[PDB]
Amino acid sequence: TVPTEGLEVTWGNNEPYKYWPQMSTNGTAHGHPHEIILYYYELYPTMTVVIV
Amino acid sequence: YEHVTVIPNTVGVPYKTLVNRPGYSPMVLEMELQSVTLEPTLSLDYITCEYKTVIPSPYVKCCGTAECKDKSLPDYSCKVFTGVYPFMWGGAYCFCDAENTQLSEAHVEKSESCKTEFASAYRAHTASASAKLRVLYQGNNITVAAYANGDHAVTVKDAKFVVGPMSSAWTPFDNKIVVYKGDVYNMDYPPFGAGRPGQFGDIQSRTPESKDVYANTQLVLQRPAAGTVHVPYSQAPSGFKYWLKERGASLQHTAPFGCQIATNPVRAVNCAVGNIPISIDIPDAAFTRVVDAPSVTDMSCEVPACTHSSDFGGVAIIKYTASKKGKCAVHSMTNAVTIREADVEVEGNSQLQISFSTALASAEFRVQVCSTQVHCAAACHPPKDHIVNYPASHTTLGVQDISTTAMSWVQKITGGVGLIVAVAALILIVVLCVSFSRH
Amino acid sequence: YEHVTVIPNTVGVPYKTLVNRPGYSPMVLEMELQSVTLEPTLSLDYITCEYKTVIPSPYVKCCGTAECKDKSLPDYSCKVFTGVYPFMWGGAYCFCDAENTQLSEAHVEKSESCKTEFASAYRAHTASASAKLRVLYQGNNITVAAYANGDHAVTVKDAKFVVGPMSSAWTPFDNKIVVYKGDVYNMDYPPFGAGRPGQFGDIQSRTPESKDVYANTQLVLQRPAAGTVHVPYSQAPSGFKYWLKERGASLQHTAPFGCQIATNPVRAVNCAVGNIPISIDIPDAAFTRVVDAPSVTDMSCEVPACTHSSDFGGVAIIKYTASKKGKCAVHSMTNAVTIREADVEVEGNSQLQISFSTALASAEFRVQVCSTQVHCAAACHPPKDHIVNYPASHTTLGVQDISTTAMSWVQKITGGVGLIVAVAALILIVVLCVSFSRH
Ligand SMILES: *[C@@H]1O[C@H](CO)[C@@H](O)[C@H](O)[C@H]1NC(C)=O
Ligand SMILES: *[C@@H]1O[C@H](CO)[C@@H](O)[C@H](O)[C@H]1NC(C)=O
Ligand SMILES: *[C@@H]1O[C@H](CO)[C@@H](O)[C@H](O)[C@H]1NC(C)=O
Ligand SMILES: *[C@@H]1O[C@H](CO)[C@@H](O)[C@H](O)[C@H]1NC(C)=O
Ligand SMILES: *[C@@H]1O[C@H](CO)[C@@H](O)[C@H](O)[C@H]1NC(C)=O
């Protein structure tokens, strides 16, 4: 799993690798109300439930 | 003119600042960090290595009794045995069939190879810091190098820079460390003069050239077998060899915040904590008056594409009308949007093109070009790739950043509910007033 | 067998402790402190010394105009003057009666004498500690030397000693110090690259062998006088010379707690703060069994003189009966009285004499000699001299220490007043009972 801050991986005698995450979703921020909520749920899961 | 700014402690991300002085045209500088180094102060305690055992020839004395005396050598031992009858290749050694004795002795020294294979124990104290920068200054790249505290000043091309101090005192080293051929460990080594028979620290010395040695290995002599000449003994094996086979992982592979470790001299490089303030003094000959710079009178904005990825995923087009040929600066007036270009060339009646990156779902921002402002707005789409190999180039979002369509829905629901409360309360007030008067 | 004690940090006063182990005779030890040293960690910043000015021959060009170019040397200057007319010992130099010109230049360097006369700036960090002790052991004197922390052990005559850590972290040095030929001052020197034209630090360098020099003195050239060939100038005088005439008193004469200071290396000696714990281990071969020690059966005490001065001003005489000849220890069982002797010799039926010191006005204490107790008492007179040249060898007194005569008067007065209140209270209770019952 790749956290927010990143991951570092070392394999044998080679140099280490670095990975960072990027935004993606299947919802949309424009359109019907039920599609808007899915957009923010998949990006900030814990804060969406509390506020709503 | 004096200017002060603050820069976060991240390597590989450029930053920009604005200089504004009344009566003159504005100026924009670009700064980027390349390396930060920390270095502690060290003191030596003692060193360790492998050992050697010395056994001289036995003494077989026949038809008599022998004795031995005491000495001052480390781990000295003596014993006398009775009832021996040794043999050799041609027959028995001595005539008597009893009343024979044997004497044996041994002691411990320091091996010769301690001048190549050894480990060193240190004591650590507070560390210093250093830094190195690249600055874009009047169309050229210059480099500066200075200590990260307020007691150093450097001058390059008639400009003076002062950097530091840092905002945090975090360090990855403890009070006690151990070093061996490029690896650094955190360990609580035993006190000098208090070693143990089978662990790290059975042999101790103060310097590879010194003559004093402390040893705490067990050594007991045992009885010779019948018909043989030899000197057997029992002893705990070396502790330095055992440590090499089970020492575990080093500090480079376990340290937090992504620091790197080197040993000659001991350093830690590129730790991402805190932020660094910077101060710069600019002379008067570097400025340009307002009347000599060109003026721009009519503007409009259009945004044909936007995608809020971690790279520069935007493009914009601006139209302008200029008075005469010259140079100008470009700067953004909002914190959530970054613009790559620093300056442009304007002439006649034409257009110019720029690029930007942002994290907003709905983009609204203002752009300033030589003392005038314009308004841009567009809608943005999300990307398709999940994982990339470089950090973001824009800042994070707050609670107030919400798409325009979502903000509209909140207003209708909130406003409508408030009306039902408002109308109900007026009924209560009127009905209470009539009852008060009627009585 | 382990034993722990605590001694105050004062030099030149002996102390005694008691070791008591069941099955063996008691043994008394004595210890005395001879030196304590503190030493910080230093790092160098820069040095300062005098400067020198270099001026070459002037250039006179007649019937023409001259010009000059720029150079990178420190404090460079060039100027051009018009309308000159020089003279020499034989007559005028050049034919033309006007349109002559003169060129002059100068720059600043570093003097050669800087390798012998210079001052140095440092930064200071946490310090270490060391100590030296004298112990009376088994009827002989021995010396030990060790670091004052829990990370060192020494062995003398089969006994281990551990000294430290200290109870206070007070140090007389600040973060910045300046050193010059045996003197140390506390000073806040200006940063590197930010000197002043007439104070300490106008010229700076990183090491006595460096080639890079920074200078911020003022240098202005002036017009030559009529008929002469010379190069006048104006410049602020040296700042390092002024400091030597106005530096004031050093730390050795101003430091608190009575510390001493030496500079090669920088150390502080004999500062009186805190106390030091000590741990000692004694082998089993050093004790004597109780069956072998002599016994004492009858005891008495008589004291012929007492004056409670800062020296040993008491004498006592004790009678005894002993079973057989041998050695014995003496020890006091009160804290307000100290006894000088550690061991005594006993035989037959005789008497022995001791001396003591105390600050009490009325004396009452006990003495132990080989597992027996005796009681002594006396009255003491005050001394007649006002001032001495050595500290006291006894402890201070508390509020419960009062002369026997004074205690009697307080008891009588408090008892007498208390009786009146007691008799009054009984009368009131009897009356109150009759009123309650009768109604
Ligand atoms: C979105 O839909 C695609 C459809 O193939 C699916 O693979 C993916 O797991 C879904 N979720 C996200 C976050 O992309
Ligand atoms: C090379 O050998 C010398 C002694 O001959 C030793 O001091 C040094 O540490 C060795 N080099 C390394 C990298 O161990
Ligand atoms: C040097 O300046 C040029 C602009 O003239 C810039 O494109 C380049 O990135 C600079 N060099 C580095 C190493 O950034
Ligand atoms: C003695 O002179 C040398 C240079 O010749 C100098 O380094 C040293 O500090 C001087 N020592 C004293 C005590 O003056
Ligand atoms: C050394 O020991 C003797 C007794 O043997 C004692 O009298 C003397 O005071 C000791 N030395 C010092 C400096 O006290």
Q: Which atom of ligand 1 is nearest to the CA of A42?
A: 13
Q: Cis (ω within 30 of 0) for the bond into C277?
A: no
**Whole-number Å distance between alpha carbons of C307 and C311:** 9
Q: Phi and psi of C322, rounded to 5°?
A: -120, 145
Q: Which atom of ligand 4 is nearest to the CA of C181?
A: 13
Q: Are strands B183-186 and B176-180 parallel, antiparallel or unpaired?
A: antiparallel
> Measured from the CB, is residue A24 less than 6 Å from ligand 1?
yes
Token pair listed for C187 = 């000073």
CB of B377 within 8 Å of a chain C CB? The answer is: no
Nearest CA to C361 out of C401, C313, C388 is that of: C401
Token pair listed for B282 = 């600019």
Ligand nearest to the CA of C141: 5
Name C100's bridge partners: C62
**Whole-number Å distance between alpha carbons of B287 and C335:** 83
Q: State how far the alpha carbon of B81 is from the alpha carbons of B62, B91, B106, B234, C74, in Å.
A: 12, 22, 15, 17, 87
Cβ contact (<8 Å) for B405 and A10? no
Token pair listed for B47 = 């060193």
Q: Which residues of A touch B (CB under 8 A)?
A: 2, 6, 8, 10, 18-25, 29-31, 33, 36
Residue type, C367: V
Residue minimizing CA distance to atom 3 of ligand 4: C116
- What 3-state class would DSSP assign to C433? helix
- CA B356 to ligand 1 centroid distance, Å: 28
With beta carbons under 8 A apart, name residues in chain A contacting B406. 29, 36
Residue from B39, B123, B126, B151 whose CB has the most chain C CBs within 10 Å, to mutate: B151
Q: Phi and psi of B389, rounded to 5°?
A: -115, 20
Q: Would you put residue B82 in left (φ > 0), alpha (ψ -120 to 50) or beta?
A: beta
Q: State how far the alpha carbon of B369 is from the alpha carbons of B295, B357, C51, in Å.
A: 9, 19, 52
DSSP 8-class letter at C306: E
Q: Cis (ω within 30 of 0) for the bond into B8?
A: no
Q: Would you put residue C181 in left (φ > 0), alpha (ψ -120 to 50) or beta?
A: left
Nearest CA to C27 out of C11, C16, C35 is that of: C16
**Whole-number Å distance between alpha carbons of B80 and B425:** 114
- What 3-state class would DSSP assign to C394? coil
Partner-chain residue, chosen from A24, A29, A33, that has the shortest CB–CB distance to B403: A29
- What 3-state class would DSSP assign to C293? coil
Ligand 2 pocket test, candidate residues B47, B113, B115, B116, most atoms within 8 A of CB = B116
Measured in whole angstroms, the distance separating CA B83 from the mean position of its chain's CA atoms is 70
Residue of B nearest to A21 (CA): B387
> Measured from the CB, is residue B21 less than 6 Å from ligand 2?
no
Residue minimizing CA distance to atom 1 of ligand 1: A26
Ligand nearest to the CA of C114: 4
Residue minimizing CA distance to atom 9 of ligand 4: C116
Name C47's bridge partners: C120, C205
Partner-chain residue, chosen from C41, C152, C193, that has the shortest CB–CB distance to B154: C193
Q: State how far the alpha carbon of B99 is from the alpha carbons of B61, B64, B95, in Å.
A: 9, 6, 11
Residue from C122, C149, C151, C187 whose CB has the most chain B CBs within 10 Å, to mutate: C151
Residue type, B293: A
- CA-based max dimension of chain C: 149
- CA A26 to ligand 1 centroid distance, Å: 6
Q: How would you label C249-264 residue by residue, b for 16+ Cβ within 10 Å and e otherwise?
A: ebbeeebeeebebeee
Q: State how far the alpha carbon of B237 is from the alpha carbons of B31, B216, B219, C112, in Å.
A: 59, 11, 11, 62
Ligand nearest to the CA of B143: 3
Nearest CA to C310 out of C388, C407, C257 is that of: C388
Residue type, B374: V
Token pair listed for B317 = 């087009």
**Whole-number Å distance between alpha carbons of C172 and C186:** 10
Cβ contact (<8 Å) for B361 and A29? yes
Residue minimizing CA distance to atom 4 of ligand 2: B116
Sign, CA dihedral C383-C389-C391-C393, equals: negative
Secondary structure in 3-state letters for chain B: CEEEEEEECCCCCCEEEEECCCCECCEEEEEEEEEEEEEEEEEEEEEECCEEEECCCCEEECCCCCCCCCCCCCCCEEEEEECCCCECCCCECCCCCCCCEEEEEEEEEECHHHHCCCEEEEEEEEEEEEEEEEEEECCEEEEEEEECCCCECEEECCEEEEECCCCCCCCCCCCEEEEECCEEEECCCCCECCCCCCCCCCEEECCCCCCCCEECCCEEECCCCCCCCCCCEEECCCHHHHHHHCCCCCCCCCCCCCCEEEECCEEEECCCCCEEEEEEECCHHHCCECCCCCCEEEEEEEEEEEECCCCCCEEEEEEEEECCCEEEEEEECCCCEEECCCEEEECCEEEEEECEEECCCEEEEEEEECCCEEEEEEECECCCCCEECCCCCCCCCCCCCCCHHHHHHHHHHHHHHHHHHHHHHHHHHHHHHHHHHHC
Ligand 4 pocket test, candidate residues C47, C114, C115, C116, most atoms within 8 A of CB = C116
Name C19's bridge partners: C27
Nearest CA to B189 out of B44, B52, B38 is that of: B44
Name B30's bridge partners: B16, B136
Q: State how far the alpha carbon of B332 is from the alpha carbons of B282, B287, B356, C175, in Å.
A: 23, 21, 10, 45
Beta carbons within 10 angstroms of residue B172's beta carbon: 18
Angle (CA) B374-B378-B383 rounded to 5° is 135
Structure-determination approach: cryo-EM
Q: Which atom of ligand 2 is nearest to the CA of B115?
A: 4
Cβ contact (<8 Å) for A24 and B386? yes
- Asked if B127 and B38 touch (Cβ cutoff 8 Å), the reply is yes
CB of B265 within 8 Å of a chain C CB? The answer is: no
Partner-chain residue, chosen from B383, B390, B406, that has the shortest CB–CB distance to A20: B390
Q: Which long-range contacts (CB under 8 A, 24 or more apart) does B212-218 make?
A: B213/B74, B213/B108, B213/B109, B213/B110, B214/B74, B215/B51, B215/B74, B215/B75, B215/B108, B217/B51, B217/B75, B217/B108
Going by C-beta distance under 8 Å and a sequence separation of 6 or more, which residues neighbour residue B257?
B170, B172, B271, B272, B273
CA dihedral C200, C206, C212, C213 (to 10 degrees): 0
Token pair listed for C212 = 């890079």
Strands (E), C307-348: 314-321, 326-332, 337-339, 343-346
- CA C117 to ligand 4 centroid distance, Å: 8
What is the resolution in angstroms?
A: 3.2
DSSP 8-class letter at C396: -
Interface of B with A in 217-256 (CB under 8 A): 253
Cβ contact (<8 Å) for B191 and C152? yes
Sign, CA dihedral C406-C407-C409-C414, equals: positive
Could you tell me the fold of the domain covering B296-379? Immunoglobulin-like (2.60.40)
Ligand nearest to the CA of B136: 3
- Asked if C230 and C221 touch (Cβ cutoff 8 Å), the reply is no
